[PDB]
Design a protein around this ligand. Structure first.
Ligand SMILES: Cc1onc(C(=O)O)c1C[C@H](N)C(=O)O
Ligand SMILES: Cc1onc(C(=O)O)c1C[C@H](N)C(=O)O
Ligand SMILES: [Zn+2]
Ligand SMILES: [Zn+2]
Lengths: 258, 258
């Protein structure tokens, strides 16, 4: 009866409340996706339980086991009823799970420590001094690996065989690496996260150039799930009423520190 | 077995070629959606016939008869198998037809004749010498009618009662009205069209301010159509491969004349 929602601890989408240890259930969490989940559930008429994905991953199929990990895996193997998180709609995922229309629009972007002499993906691909990588088990990494576009293919060829590994387990790891490499490391991540970090202390990173592509986040459900239709219509309704724009302003800029 | 595609004459999505009169069938047309249709048909493996929507409209429901017009209507009443055009994904439409994930992201925008003292929707709403309206039977008009946001709610109350009518039958009429009103008419239309016209002679218009919202265009099919699934996956692949971005650059800026 109670809908099991899988999500991920990724600021500002889902974060632990400062006093979480003294709270119970859903009240332990706060953020863009926590607010969105409450709204979706209310408009669809269901009770739910927020659960943090076990492996803390978004979702990718292991090439040798062919088993899906992350929130995608939670949906595919029946551990969760729905995923409400900054989960990117992609072809490989849409083949195994359903997605509502996008509740957020974004694109792969470049994050640099302020002062880094880099203004585009082309700038990165033509140099070697500054290292650059992406998030593991994410859609950005999958994008580069499967891209036939000149500049991106070249970037992927470098990243896949760069040593030490230029990939990170979480965005927080990528951000920290950018901040500590004194401009010698650039991080490729979605514009949404890039823009968020750019508004947080110590205000030493920035998004440079335009986005490399265009995509969106969607609320996901198991393939053929009955919840799918209601959830999709709810997302459209909430977007048309400006709720999503309000949540973005609330968590990104109203609370900005820079 | 030939798929009947309903579309609309809206540059640069679908336009008649210069020598269209000596051409036949699909060959008569060119544009972003013409190229998209060919790609979709190729990847989904079907032959098709492009047909221009009879009433030249996108799609809205008549409040009294409850009858859908435009391309939406042709899908709903079984006149076309698919709609490949700059058709906006909205709640009221999704309730009667199916939409693929978006192939283009955009938002409502403000078109002004260069020099017009307007920088935002708030500005328009706070004044009256400059009239403004939108396209009839389109998603922008519906947006304003259904929006509960203060500023947009106010703008709607004004447009719905304005006399003469501030509404137009086609974007071409709206653009023409802007160009001939010596700055006394502002046109509310989607950013895609606004940005296109801004790169067209006589280069006397421009998009001002940011978008009023975020939405997307989707390929539409009759609710429950067997084609929906393949088409949706086709759109996702084309976007990930960079084709959609390629077509945008091809029809918007590579051919810009300003
Ligand atoms: C968040 C987030 O921020 N940046 C990324 C990325 O993959 O670069 C992600 C994960 C991505 N949305 C996905 O794999 O769904
Ligand atoms: C194109 C196009 O460009 N501007 C508009 C509009 O409704 O303002 C439209 C129509 C809209 N995409 C729809 O009603 O689907
Ligand atoms: Zn804690
Ligand atoms: Zn192709």
């Amino acid at each position: 009866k109670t809908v099991v929602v899988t999500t991920i601890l990724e600021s500002p989408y889902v974060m632990m409340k400062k006093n979480h240890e003294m709270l119970e259930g859903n009240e332990r969490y706060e953020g863009y996706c926590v607010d969105l989940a409450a709204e979706i559930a209310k408009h669809c008429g269901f009770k739910y339980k927020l659960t943090i994905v076990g492996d803390g991953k978004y979702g990718a199929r292991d090439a040798d086991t062919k088993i899906w990990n992350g929130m995608v895996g939670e949906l595919v193997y029946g551990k969760a009823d729905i995923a409400i998180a900054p989960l990117t709609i992609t072809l490989v995922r849409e083949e195994v799970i359903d997605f509502s229309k996008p509740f957020m629009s974004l694109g792969i972007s470049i994050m640099i420590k302020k002062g880094t002499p880099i203004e585009s993906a082309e700038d990165l691909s033509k140099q070697t001094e500054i290292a650059y990588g992406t998030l593991d088990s994410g859609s950005t990494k999958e994008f580069f690996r499967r891209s036939k576009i000149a500049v991106f293919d070249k970037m992927w060829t470098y990243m896949r065989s760069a040593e030490p590994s230029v990939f990170v387990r979480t965005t927080a790891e990528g951000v920290a690496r950018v901040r500590k490499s004194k401009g010698k490391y650039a991080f490729l991540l979605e514009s949404t996260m890039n823009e968020y970090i750019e508004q947080r202390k110590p205000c030493d990173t920035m998004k440079v150039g335009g986005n490399l592509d265009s995509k969106g986040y969607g609320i996901a459900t198991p393939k053929g799930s009955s919840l799918g239709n209601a959830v999709n219509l709810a997302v459209l309704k909430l977007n048309e009423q400006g709720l999503l724009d309000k949540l973005k302003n609330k968590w990104w800029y109203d609370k900005g520190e820079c």
